[PDB]
Symmetry: C7
Subunit: 261 residues, 7 copies
């Protein structure tokens, strides 16, 4: 006969039923909307169905536990389990989301761009495109390498083509008895004769070290990045020919034997 | 004689009993439904029984603590322990869920497909299929390698067969006294004579470096990926035969001895 | 003389005492039940006693803090400390639970089975059994290796015996002056003479590379996995005998000396 | 003159004082009990005093913040700081607790037992005992190695003495001109003459590879683990003596010189 | 006919509608303001649109769940899921934010500055600029290297140009029979003759070690960082010339043969 | 004119002011007490001032937010920020606290003690003392090494001096033509003649392997740890002298040349 | 006409407006105070402006959400997002705070001090100063190395200059035919003749091992750390001179050839 008890219980049960039916209808409608939108554009059938099933399950679970709490049954354990599952999913997706964030940062900063020869953590090649999750680059041999963006952000990013001017380095080995002045002036003449070698930059021709069987001269020349290999090959061939003509001989690994008995 | 105290306590105890019995019945029914569904399709008996036991235990624990809270006993410690257990389970399953997410990403993006020769972190072979957790690929020797998808997403993904055109590289060593013009023109004629070598692409025949005992010429030719090994073998054999015929000798490791005593 | 204050305090203290005594009795009864069940089956005495003591301590702590909260003393700090302890225990057991999950996944997917020659992260051998936490495999030398399942799921899983057909690879070194046609046809005849070598599969006999002191021919033959070692040994012995008979000599590491003085 | 305000405040302050004094008395009594129990058995004085001080500080802090909350001052910041400290302590003790859990798992599963020759992550020796935190093993040289149990659970666990039968492997190098039939039959006779070599198991005597300066025969024999070293030494000595008697000479590293000038 | 029930429900529904419409209007206005501000300055179109969409979605979700809670439907599960998503996003952005923090610390402390030759974890070059996320440095060869600031803070930071004075080290190998006093005094005279070598600092010329085929003298000289390479090259060339003039011969790798047969 | 509204607001504001002033006074008094206690014993001035400032700031922040909450302003955001800061501090101090815990475990278990020759992760030396955070040990060369206790608990702990008896191992190389019986009996006589070599333990003198240029005999002798180096040196010198006297010659690296041309 | 509803709503809205305006004024005043204090001392302009903007944004956000909660709109989602952001910031700053804590520990314990030659994880040099985040040390070559304090606390800390006495080690190689007594007594006389070598410490001159081509004597001498290099060089030079005078010859890498054909 109480005016508050039975009335309150009836209100609670009616409100819980209304909440659960409204939530189920909204879940069905939102699943319909999301699947319509995903089919209307590019999507994968199986993955899309899996995602739609997961989101519908999540929404209906939310509605069910909300209705249970409105009824009066504590749902703290279910909330804690859902939080643990969410933390597990977040830890699982940490790698993919980190790759996505690294890709966004790479797009915004533009450390490298398409058609630029780079070196991303030990692999060198021309960059084709930079997608959201991973980039695509072609090695000089023609192999395609796909690198996750996280592994690019972590570690060095060497860019060969950013600077128009790069330097070559020659290691020329001649015999000990060879005339140092003669070899130095021959190398200097060879360097001067070339035109693709920049002249305003330093052109060092010095004795680098005293090796085990030969003395190594270091020759450093700067040139535009577009002619580096060609100038290196031409200078090396000219050095070989000029040393052959001038009598300077490249020494083979030399050892001396103290004969006994 | 109070109208609220005894009535409220009776309502609380009756509601708690109703909640616990309803929860137990629902747990039994849902266990029956889930085991029927899992038996009706592919499943493993022992693992399925373990999972059903765990889910039934979780549901009955939820119902019991909800009934205890309705009675009036605080369950915050039990909730915290359940949350800690959930976090432990999530940390344990982090690896498996990360592998699953990586597999989903690989399926969606399709960096590689079945029947495509790839190199996933140091191991090369033809891809057979890409499952949810791990892929299957066959090495050239015929060994089957199963790689977790997380270890594929992390690190480089080299695709040999994506580009139809790849480049070969030859390292040919000849003696110092050999005629550079003669060897270069012989190699050029050998390269020209072949038809499987693409002609629009660069075909470099230059002196690469001055080695310890020999001078190494670098020969680079581009060809379709389907004939790379065959063209390499044919060019190498032709180089051997032509150098033998023309008198150019491949030098053995050469050293000179300064005899004493 | 108040009808609510003293009555409420008496109800609170009586309810707290009832709750704590009921919890203690239930803890004793559940400890009795769990120890009876664990003794009735396989269990370790000391570990079982430790686990029973820990679970009884946890239950009595839950009951005590619930009674304290019913009395009216805040237990939030105790709850937080229990949560921190649970998180510590979960972090500690992360490794063991990850191993268990990996074992469950391995059992369900069956990447490898008993009596199958595999290679799990650098160690090769025949699989004996796959338990919940770790597998057991016997090396070819007869050593027993026990590997945690987490270390198996992480990293590659090479299966030698999955494919019935595998390929052998020979590296045969002959002298430079040897007749290439003669050695190639001799190797071809040796390969043809064998019956265990599959004929529908490719049988390549080509010149692989020009080594420092010898030219290495690559011979590749496919055969059933059950005869791989035997066919390799037989082919190698036949190659040795035929090269000895035909006059082709395997060259020792060859160097030439430019004598001086 | 209000009947509820002053009465409620007096009740609150009296209850807070009673709670704090009861908590302090209980903390003193429990510290007395725990130190009596720890002194009555094996314990370290300084570490025990440190632990008792920490637990007493924790209990008195709990009581103080409970009394403050009963008074009416919010303690949420103190609770959060205590939770952060607990998480820090848990992260610190993660290593020790993981070692303890690994030790418990090792005791329960018994991958290895006392007096069994094992190899735990690169170090080999006889196991003496397995404690809760770390095991003790003696190397063949006599050095004692103590390994944490976590580092044992992580990584492989090789057990030499689990299988009664193990296999030896011989690498015998003879000259190229040596008679293959003669050396094979000599090795076969040597193997047959021994009794400690199991005869039901495979006994392979084949040509393994063509080395740089010698041909290596592979001899594999199975025997009980208790005679492995002895049978290896005896077979090796017999091989040496028989090859010396039969004229087969073990070749030194052989090279040939092409003399010039 | 109740004066509180219907009135309270009407107030709740009207307040919820007002809250949701106000939140939607505020979200639209703040999106307009933020996009106006971002367009007015430097920004990327696609990334800016993505960020604006995400922030608008977050704000509207906040408003919707606030309205739902005002209505009376529990939103604890939605709150937990949002917290899990936030934790996942934080774990994903941990790398980028750590790089930003490292960059801020590097800017504040200034371990290195523009135009200063450094060595950041194995790569050496001149620093160009230090941005928020990553620095830019040019190698001596002319290659541009972009290093994340986190990888710079972690690990050593070697600064070559901080100290104006650096030391060179020479390893000179002479024959065993050479006169130690003569070579030491020759090296001392060579060191004294130079002017770019600092004289107040130590100038050690001692016998370092007895090598396999030569005795190595260690010569250490200090000089300004601006002349280090030049002084090294000049001293080395002078050492070569003076040893050639004085008769001391640099020994080749020397071995002695005990001829037999 | 309301008897509850204005009275309640006045009570709230007065209580908040009393709480904040009491908290400030208590913070000042506790800072005075803690600085008096820290000055009265060993402490560092700057670090102590920093810690006192931090603890006073924390206490005053707690009091301020408690007063704000008593006033009625929600402090949930401040609580969350304080929790995040506490978690950051805990993650930062994880390393130091782990080192402290490892040190406590090392002190309690005593794997090694002062004056005992050990090998903690690749570095060997005599232990001087074990502090709370790091141990101190002196290398045989006299260098002092300080190792964090965490790096000691992680990884192996080799104890040389725990076992009084250790084993030496000799690798003696003799020529192929040497008499095996003669060399074995000579080594046996040398071993027997020594007194510091334990006789009850095994003393193996066997042919270990057939090397490239020599046959290596393995000689194993057990002795007390206090005479290991001395017995090794004495046995080696005696072996040299006896082999010189008996005509057995230690062979140099031997190769044979097949002279051509 | 209700006396509680409209009055309560007016009180709520007025209190919310007062709270938000007070919070904004306090935020402006505290920003003014903090920027005045930071400008009055050493600070960086851009970083200081960034920090002031962040702290002002945080304070105004706190005030806004507090006002919203006072109004009655739930802010749980905003609180959760703020907590997630705080956790992300803490994870980002974990490295910097760990470095700071390690620096504090290093300052307090003083494992090394200024002007003391140390070796911190592979790099050796003299310590200049130890700052809060990173130390500064100068290598013997003169290069400045800045090491984060976390990388110093982790791993070994070798201190060369802590012990005044250190030991040198000589490896002297003589020919097999050399007289062992003669070389030992010569080395003993050389050691005795020096005065900087401590005599109370052990001075071992023994035969260490039988090398491939020479017998290596080990000479160990202890001396003060201030004369280690000088005594080493002097002893080595004296050894060379005395062996040259006494006829003992240091052997070159010796091999013997078995001539054939």
């Amino acid at each position: 006969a109480n005016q508050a008890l039975l009335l309150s219980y009836a209100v609670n049960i009616v409100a819980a039923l209304a909440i659960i039916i409204v939530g189920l209808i909204i879940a069905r409608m939102i699943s319909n909307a999301v699947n319509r939108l995903m089919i209307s554009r590019k999507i994968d059938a199986t993955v899309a169905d899996f995602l739609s099933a997961l989101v519908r399950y999540g929404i209906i679970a939310f509605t069910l536990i909300a209705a249970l709490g409105r009824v009066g049954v504590q749902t703290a354990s279910v909330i804690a389990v859902l939080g643990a599952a969410g933390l597990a999913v977040g830890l699982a997706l940490q790698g993919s989301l980190s790759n996505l964030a690294a890709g966004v940062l790479l797009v915004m900063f533009r450390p490298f761009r398409a058609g630029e020869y780079v070196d991303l953590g030990g692999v060198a090649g021309t960059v084709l495109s930079v997608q959201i999750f991973s980039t695509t680059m072609r090695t000089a041999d023609g192999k395609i390498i796909v690198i996750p963006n996280g592994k690019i952000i972590a570690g060095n990013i060497i860019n060969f083509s950013r600077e128009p001017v790069r330097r070559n380095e020659f290691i020329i080995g001649v015999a000990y008895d060879s005339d140092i002045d003669q070899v130095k002036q021959i190398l200097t003449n060879i360097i001067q004769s070339e035109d693709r070698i920049l002249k305003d930059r330093e052109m060092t021709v010095r004795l680098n070290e005293l090796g085990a069987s030969s003395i190594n001269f270091v020759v450093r020349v700067w040139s535009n990045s577009g002619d580096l290999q060609n100038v290196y090959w031409d200078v090396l061939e000219r050095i070989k020919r000029e040393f052959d003509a001038a009598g300077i001989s490249f020494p083979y690994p030399q050892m001396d034997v103290n004969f006994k008995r």
